[PDB]
């Protein structure tokens, strides 16, 4: 029953249990994890107020598997983002000088907690560490131009993830809200997903082995739109928190 994150503290880089009321992130306690972040974590004894440490991307994923069109049936359409696209909370998304329009896409993210393959939808729960937030950043011109979505979605910084992974949250009916400079762009519930978390894990794990720490982005609701130099994009998911990233365009 925890928020699993990663931190850069005085004593270095570590997993941590991030404790406290969600509406006061400053006064939250980062309780340093020693071993077994995907099993039963044990703790070093050290902790810091969260304000005192750098909050990082909550996982080092070997791959990011993603779902296309998934909000209100056709089979899931999946694609990959390279783990070099991942950044954590508050790290800038850097737009290539030549790419326009570049879109945000707020998404519920699944974090896989153990090696698995050929998992049934009903068994997905036993293989899921928990849930976090992803921003499936996408160069739309490049999507249309390539047909394949890989390049459009694969630029460095195009996979913000965080702020942390919640292990006990039920993904079936959670609100997701995306803001760009405080203006609401996406506003929907995960209960509108065409393929639910179990169906997504069943589908993907029938294709490829999923490893502890692997991320799955489960698709974005209506209201996708452009981001530009100077913008800030915040995605909030109920029961999880808020993933926020500034935006800069290269060459400015």
Task: Kindly state the helix (H) or strand (E) to which residue 214 belongs, with its residue range.
Answer: none
Our CB check for Zn ion shows the closer of 7 and 112 to be 112
User: 136, 179, 202, 214: which one contacts Zn ion (CB under 5 A)?
Assistant: 136
| Distances, alpha carbon 162 to alpha carbons 72, 175, 195, in Å | 25, 16, 22
Match 């972040």 to its residue by tokens: 37
Asked if residue 156 belongs to a known ligand binding site, the reply is: no
Pairing outcome for strands 86-87 and 159-166: parallel
Of 2, 72, 13, which is closest to residue 40 (Cα–Cα)?
A: 2
Tell which positions 56-115 bind Zn ion, by CB under 5 A: 105
- CB atoms near residue 78 (< 10 Å): 16
- Which stretch, 123-131, 135-143, 196-204, 242-250, contacts Zn ion (CB under 5 A)? 135-143
Asked if residue 155 belongs to a known ligand binding site, the reply is: no
Minimum gap (Å) between residue 167 Cβ and Zn ion: 23
Asked if residue 19 belongs to a known ligand binding site, the reply is: no
Cβ–Cβ under 8 Å, residues 213 and 109: no
Binding mask 206-245 for Zn ion (x = CB under 5 A): --------------x-------------------------
Residues that bind Zn ion (CB under 5 A): 105, 136, 220
**Which residues participate in the annotated binding site for Zn(2+)?**
105, 107, 136, 175, 187
């Amino acid at each position: 029953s925890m928020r699993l994150g990663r931190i850069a503290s005085p004593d270095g880089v570590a997993f941590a249990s991030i404790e406290g009321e969600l509406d006061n992130p400053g006064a939250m306690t980062a309780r340093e994890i020693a071993e077994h972040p995907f099993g039963t974590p044990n703790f070093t004894g050290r902790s810091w107020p969260l304000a005192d440490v750098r909050l990082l991307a909550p996982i080092l994923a070997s791959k990011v598997v993603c779902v296309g069109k998934n909000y209100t049936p056709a089979d899931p359409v999946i694609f990959l983002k390279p783990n070099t696209a991942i950044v954590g909370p508050n790290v800038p998304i850097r737009l290539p000088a030549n790419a326009s329009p570049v879109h945000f896409e707020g998404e519920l993210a699944i974090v896989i907690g153990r090696p698995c393959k050929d998992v049934s939808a009903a068994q997905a729960v036993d293989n899921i560490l928990g849930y976090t937030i992803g921003n499936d950043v996408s160069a739309r011109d490049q999507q249309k131009s390539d047909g394949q979505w890989t390049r459009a979605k694969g630029h460095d910084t195009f996979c913000p993830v965080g702020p942390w992974i919640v292990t006990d949250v039920d993904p079936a009916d959670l609100e997701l809200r995306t803001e760009v400079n405080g203006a609401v762009k996406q506003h929907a519930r995960t209960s509108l997903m065409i393929h639910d978390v179990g169906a997504i894990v069943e589908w993907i794990s029938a294709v490829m082995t999923l490893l502890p720490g692997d991320l799955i982005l489960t698709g974005t609701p209506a209201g996708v739109g452009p981001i530009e130099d100077g913008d800030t994009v915040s995605i909030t998911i109920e029961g999880i928190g808020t993933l926020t990233n500034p935006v800069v365009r290269k060459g400015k």
